[PDB]
Structure formats: structure tokens, C-alpha cells
């Protein structure tokens with residue numbers, strides 16, 4: 055019981071491009087660019103699609119930086135979140151109806167305005183370290199427990215429908 059998602063962090067040496075959810079679920083919070091991997095598309099096509107739709111950006115390559123599992127109390131189904139980062143982007147960031155991209159200096163990242171797990175794994179992302187992580191949530195604002203480990207290589211899940 056799981057659902058497959060992507061999260062894309064556009065990360066340059068001094069800055070990170072985040073985006074502000076403009077409405078709907080998670081409105082008011084800054085996040086990486088991502089969403090549900092649909093049926094008929096691969097994980098990496100889904101990551102590129104969500105980045106294109108949300109930021110208007112194209113990337114030459116995505117690096118696999120980590121894997122996050124979300125569990126929610128009252129929901130039996132886990133979120134399987136494949137996390138990517140990209141150094142090299144093409145195009146000018148422009149908002150959609152869903153998301154507005156903005157650049158943040160790396161020491162200025164607005165963790166109080168982001169999802170609570172971000173404070174945990176973002177330091178590893180910024181140190182250029184790969185990670186596996188798990189967060190048990192109660193509601194949107196509360197983490198009940200977590201496990202986060204640095205990994206040498208991101209484990210491959212072999213999803214054969216994606």
C-alpha cells in the first residue's frame with residue numbers, strides 16, 4: 055500500500071529555487087517541485103513534468119539524491135517519494151496557477167514556511183549527501199517519529215510500471 059511521488063530540488067552553489075503553493079493543499083508553504091507520478095509515465099518523466107508545469111523549467115539531468123517515505127496516522131497507504139536535485143536548468147522560472155518559483159539564498163531557506171520534514175533532510179541535501187528517510191506524520195504540522203540516514207548510493211526500487 056503506497057503511492058509514488060517525485061520531489062525536485064533546483065540547487066545552485068549559493069541558492070535554491072523553491073516554489074510557493076498558491077492554493078489548494080499545502081497553500082502558503084514553500085517546497086521543492088513535485089507531485090504524483092501518473093500511470094503511463096516513468097518516475098523521471100514525472101519529475102520532469104512536475105518541474106516543467108510548476109516552474110516552467112527544463113533540465114538536462116536529474117541526480118537521485120534520496121528517498122523519503124511518509125506515513126500518516128489514519129492512512130494505511132505510504133507515500134514513496136523519489137527525491138532528485140538538478141544543478142543545470144534551462145528557461146526562465148515562471149509561476150503556474152499551482153506554484154510560484156522564487157530563489158532563496160542557502161542560508162536564508164524559510165523552514166518555518168516549509169513542510170516540517172524539510173528541516174531534517176535539507177542539511178544533507180545541501181552537504182551533497184544522499185539519504186534515505188522516513189517520517190510518521192500526524193496531520194500536516196506534526197511529525198510523530200522519523201528515521202534519517204546518509205547513504206552511499208540511493209537504493210533502486212525497480213518500479214516496472216514506472
Ligand SMILES: COc1c(O)cc2oc3cc(O)c(CC=C(C)C)c(O)c3c(=O)c2c1CC=C(C)C
Nearest residue numbers: 059060061088089126135169171172191192193194
Ligand atoms: C514532499 O513535500 C511534502 C512534505 O515534505 C510533507 C508532506 O506532509 C504531509 C502530511 C500529511 O498529513 C498529508 C496528508 C493530508 C491529510 C490532512 C490527511 C500529506 O499529503 C502530506 C504531504 O503531501 C507532504 C508533502 C507534499 C507531497 C509531494 C510534493 C510529493
Ligand SMILES: [Zn+2]
Nearest residue numbers: 092093215216
Ligand atoms: Zn502505478
Ligand SMILES: [Zn+2]
Nearest residue numbers: 134136211213
Ligand atoms: Zn519507489
